[PDB]
Every structure is written in structure tokens, then in C-alpha cells.
Design a protein around this ligand. Structure first.
Ligand code: KQY
Ligand code: NA
Ligand code: NA
Lengths: 356, 356
């Protein structure tokens, strides 16, 4: 009787890593640390937070973060807890909470991943559940928490582009992958968007950059009105798909558009501050960033939302999110661009722990 | 209104470190790891245990330890949590528990300490209390938990050999030192044994290796019958002091003698197992081991006692302890010699967290 609750359901805390690697984070992560800190501090106005930092970084993190934020020493290859963190499941009313330890392979493994070493990334789920004394359900299937979303009422959305990629689970068919999601997330229906966001070659189109539930029966969808942008056809396809399906309880989808910023491109400055290495992916100037306002975190009573420094769409997204979540305080995080330069945003760096 | 409760009072958990440094533990610590495992398994029969291992050892510790033992990642320079973990204090009838973060300096600093780098060790207290979300009282005075003992009724016992060494707090008088113990452990009287155990030049004579309370107004004392042994005059002297002095409530001290084993000396095999490095104290053959059954741990209704493989005195200690602690299950830990080779025993590697 375990299932994954919706993100907007109450949490007891939020887990976040701490960026440090010089080959992914410009200027040895100094810029990224400031934003991580702003995100943690914002979330901690609404729910407890634990940031996890390496040995070498523990003091830095402790120094930057207010005291009501807990800092623990957990090493990682990189700081993306949405994907390397456990996925918590609950059984409400004698263990009422547990965590799923999905196999992690750096978003594509030796042939098509981001780093050739992920052995510390792989232990993060175990380590966290050990700190909390929460039971771990281990799974040999490759999965990242960024690649699924739920409504806590039986429905899951995901993308084919990610989950059906041969760099993940080449041994499993689509319908075998679906059976695992249903068994382990406690859902009875999976909606497969064909594609994620244009330009998300890091993760191969994680759904959490393209689409998310905001309540039972309604989703936000990354969108552009520019039919010359390669995003348009993906967004249109997903929109049609949502018109044709219903959720696990038979609701018609209310689709709410959320216009992407930019498009945004890495500068020569931004590329130049990243140390170059032959065990990481070479970040080049002119690369299109995979930027969507959809990559936000729902905290108890607040939406923690990206701002990329594109004023028109930064302001429009705050407006859409304020009306979409009328009972939440919406807090935009200036400097989110510093996270998208390295492959993700606010939702990618968080992992909620549901209250029981 | 905080005070240090006595060791025999109820605990919520025990903290232990994980040995790894090969310049102190023979054969890269493989012998000691087996013993710490045994010690933690034994304690875990009576109270929740958390072992703390570095990143490089986390999997190894998690493998060796039973599932009901929590394993977290807290790196340290060495694994002596009596001295480098926090000293918990409580306030009975709003925060009811806190920890004291004494300054640590590797048992005598750059000049006379055990290793030249202790900066990981210095953070262990912060980190443990951060994990537990327990307030921390910072203290600038150098002190080790091993150098003090309390009855939980206003009395403290320690040694001048340790606390009045110029390698600890050279700018404080005896009186100033005594003031800080009173304010911070909530004791009204401090008994100063002049000396600890012979050959304990690591710690400069921790009381936890010489003498401990059994109950208010009663103590076990490290003892030999051999008056040709250097230990005799130290023991004799301490015995004398207990005849003369009273506790904080003006009770007289029942003393119970506990015969030391050996003398024990480090084999050639033992010394050669240890890697030779300049930043740690060079372990030489023929060196007298600072062994004493007094270095035991009181868990919730158990006594976790050393056994050094010197059967005469091994059996005698269990006897004396089962007698002295008739409401407690005594538990001997074969292989305790592996710990003493690196300069402490069971008491030295534990740190109780009082239940509130
Ligand atoms: N370089 C890997 C970036 C991870 C982004 C995760 C996500 N939730 O889309
Ligand atoms: Na990839
Ligand atoms: Na010393």
C-alpha cells in the first residue's frame, strides 16, 4: 500500500545538494553556491531543509546557510538531488514511509552519460535514508526523479524521449518500464509525452522541464508562441496529447501554458570559467540552455520559481504561477540562470520528504 | 540550568567513530574495524547506535555493521568519539538538551599532541549536533570527554596530570579551569586526582583510564598489588585522596579496586603493521600499553567491558564488575587489545546521548 504523494502535499523536509565541481560549475561553483543558498533559505521559510555537502565544502555551506537549515556531510559526484536523491513513498492510516533506491547511471551510463564516475552519486539515496532511519526499497531499473511526475491520485506523466532511451534500460520494454512505475510509485495510469524540452540533451528530455501537475486534473506546460522555435512543435504535440487523454480518475486535463524565456545561450565568459576535463561533457559557448519556468519546487505554502533575467517572461511566469497556485506565496529566485548553465534548475536541485 | 548527567543514566543513543588511518591502526585498521563492530553490536542490544565513517569507509562500515545500527558520513582525523564528540548536557523541568563543543587540540597541540592535523576532528562536535538539531554551546577551553567523570549529583573527578598540562590550557589557572567545569557540567565540586594511569603519555593521564563513578559516592579505581610496578604509587596516591575527601553532598567515597592486566607490551608484529609517517606519533616495539578495565562503557543496563587476552585478569574484571553493577549485564569484548595498541579502549570510542 505504498505510493508517491504529489509534491504539493505536506512535507516534513526538503533535501538539497551543494555544488562544487569546477568542471561543471563556473569559477569553482562560487556563483552556484549563492543561488543554492538563496533557494535553501527561501524554502526554509516554509518547511525544514537539509543541505548535503562534501567534507571539503561542509564549513562553506554551514557558513552561507542560516542555522535553522541543517547541514550534513554527504559526498556526491554532483549536486542534483532531484535525480540522485531517494524517491519517497508513503502508506497513510507499521512503517508509513519509505524510499526507493532506483539505479542511477549519470543520465546515460558510460556510452551517453554526463560523467564517467557516479559511484558516490549512487550511494546518496542509501546515505540519506540511513540518516533518517527510513526503509530502502532497492530497484535495479535506471530512473531519475526528474523524469516522472505524479498527482498523488493514481496518475504519472513521463517522456518517451527519456525513459525509452537505450542509454537507460535497454533490457526492458516500454510496457515493462510502465509496470515498474505503477508497482513502485503506486499509480494505475501513465501518460507518455513523446518528447521533453528542446535542448535538454543532458537528461534526454526530463518531463520536469516540460510539464508538471499543479493539482488533480491540471498541468503547466512549457510553451512558446514562436513557431520558428524548435520548442513549438514539442509543446504543441504535448498539448494535443493532453486533449486526447484523461487522468487515472477520468478527469479532462486543464492545460496551462508557461512561456519559456529567451531562448538563452551560454556566453564565452560563462563557458570560459568551467575547467575542461576528459571525465565530464565539454560546455561550449553558443549552447542553447534548457530553460523552463516549469522547473520550480512546491514547498509547504510556497512556489519557489526560477528567474533567468529575461524580464518580460520572468514577470509573466510569476503571474501565471500566482494564479495557478492561488493559496501559495510565489517567490522568484533571481540568478536561476546560474543553475541552468550547468544543466538544471530549482526542481532539479530539490527532493521533498513527505510528512506522514 | 543545564548539567552533565551521569553515564549510568538513560540514553537515547551512542555515537561511535570508525577507525581507518594506517599510521595508527595496524594493517590499515582491519583488526580494529572488527572490534568496533563487536562493540557497536553489543551496545546496540541496549540502546540505538550511530557509527560515523568517512566517505572512503562508508560502504565498508555499512557492510560490517548490523542493519539496526545507523551509519552516517562524518569524517574525522581519528576515531576517538569520547574526546572529539560532544559532551551532552540536559535541563529537567523550551530546549531540554544541548551539547558542549570544547576546543580540541589532539591531546596536546603541535608540540605534544598525537597528530599534527586535527581540523576534521574539530568539526565532529558541530556535525553531530547539526545532524541531531541539538543546540551547541561553544567553549574556547581545551577539554576531552575522557578527561572528566560525573556522578550526576554535583561532583566531578579528573586529573591534574591532564588538565594542568601546559599543552592544554597554558593561560588558565587551575581555579579558572575548575570554574568552567562547574558552570558547564553543572557541578559544585571537582576532585583532582593528581595522576592517571602510568604509560598514558598519549592523553597525559585521562581519568577515564584511572577512575570512574559506579554510583554517587562510589568509584572503581585502576589497581595493582605489585609495589615494584610504577603504577602502584599512582594508584596508592589516588586511593589516599578518596580516604580524605568528600563529594558535593559531603558523602564519603566507597572505593572498589580493579586490577590492571599485564603489564602489556607491544609486539614487533604489532608495531610493523603501522605505516611510518611524520604527522603521527611513532609506535615502537616494547612500548608499555595503557591498559585498564576501568575504560569501560555504561550502556542502558549493560557494562561493555574490555578483555585484553590476559585471562587471569580478564576473568577477574568481569567478576568485580558483575558484582559492582548487579543490576547491569556485563559484556566482555574479546580483542580489546587491538584498541589499546592505538591508545584507548571502549570508553574512549563511545559518547552517550542522554534521553530527555
Ligand atoms: N547534468 C545533469 C543535470 C540534471 C538535471 C535534472 C532534471 N531534474 O531535469
Ligand atoms: Na544524456
Ligand atoms: Na600528549
Amino acid at each position: 500500500g505504498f505510493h508517491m504523494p504529489a509534491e504539493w502535499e505536506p512535507h516534513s523536509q526538503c533535501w538539497i545538494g551543494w555544488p562544487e565541481r569546477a568542471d561543471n560549475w563556473r569559477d569553482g561553483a562560487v556563483h552556484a553556491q549563492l543561488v543554492f543558498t538563496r533557494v535553501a533559505a527561501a524554502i526554509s521559510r516554509f518547511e525544514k531543509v537539509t543541505v548535503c555537502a562534501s567534507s571539503a565544502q561542509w564549513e562553506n555551506a554551514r557558513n552561507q546557510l542560516p542555522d535553522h537549515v541543517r547541514v550534513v556531510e554527504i559526498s556526491s559526484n554532483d549536486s542534483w538531488f532531484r535525480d540522485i536523491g531517494p524517491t519517497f513513498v508513503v502508506r497513510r492510516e507499521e512503517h508509513r514511509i519509505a524510499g526507493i533506491d532506483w539505479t542511477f547511471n549519470s543520465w546515460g551510463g558510460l556510452e551517453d552519460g554526463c560523467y564517467c564516475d557516479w559511484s558516490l552519486d549512487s550511494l546518496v539515496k542509501k546515505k540519506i535514508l540511513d540518516v533518517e532511519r527510513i526503509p530502502r526499497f532497492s530497484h535495479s531499473m535506471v530512473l531519475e526523479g526528474g523524469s516522472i511526475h505524479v498527482d498523488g491520485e493514481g496518475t504519472c506523466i513521463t517522456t518517451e524521449e527519456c525513459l525509452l532511451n537505450k542509454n537507460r534500460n535497454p533490457h526492458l520494454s516500454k510496457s515493462q518500464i510502465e509496470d515498474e512505475l505503477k508497482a513502485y510509485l503506486g499509480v494505475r495510469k501513465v501518460i507518455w509525452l513523446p518528447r521533453g524540452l528542446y535542448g535538454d540533451d543532458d537528461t534526454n528530455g526530463h518531463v520536469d522541464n516540460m510539464c508538471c501537475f499543479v493539482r488533480p486534473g491540471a498541468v503547466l506546460l512549457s510553451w512558446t508562441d514562436d513557431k520558428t522555435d524548435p520548442q513549438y512543435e514539442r509543446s504543441e504535440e504535448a498539448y494535443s496529447l493532453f486533449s486526447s487523454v484523461t487522468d487515472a480518475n477520468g478527469r479532462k486535463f486543464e492545460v496551462i501554458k508557461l512561456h519559456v524565456p529567451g531562448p538563452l545561450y551560454m556566453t564565452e565568459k560563462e563557458a570560459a570559467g568551467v575547467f575542461q576535463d576528459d571525465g565530464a561533457k565539454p560546455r561550449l559557448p553558443g549552447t542553447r540552455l534548457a530553460a523552463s519556468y516549469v522547473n520550480f519546487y512546491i514547498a509547504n505554502g510556497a512556489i519557489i520559481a526560477p528567474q533567468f533575467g529575461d524580464k518580460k517572461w520572468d514577470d509573466e511566469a510569476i503571474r501565471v504561477l500566482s494564479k495557478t497556485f492561488p493559496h501559495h506565496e510565489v517567490v522568484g529566485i533571481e540568478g536561476s540562470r546560474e543553475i541552468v548553465l550547468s544543466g538544471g534548475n530549482i526542481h532539479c536541485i530539490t527532493q521533498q520528504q513527505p510528512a506522514i
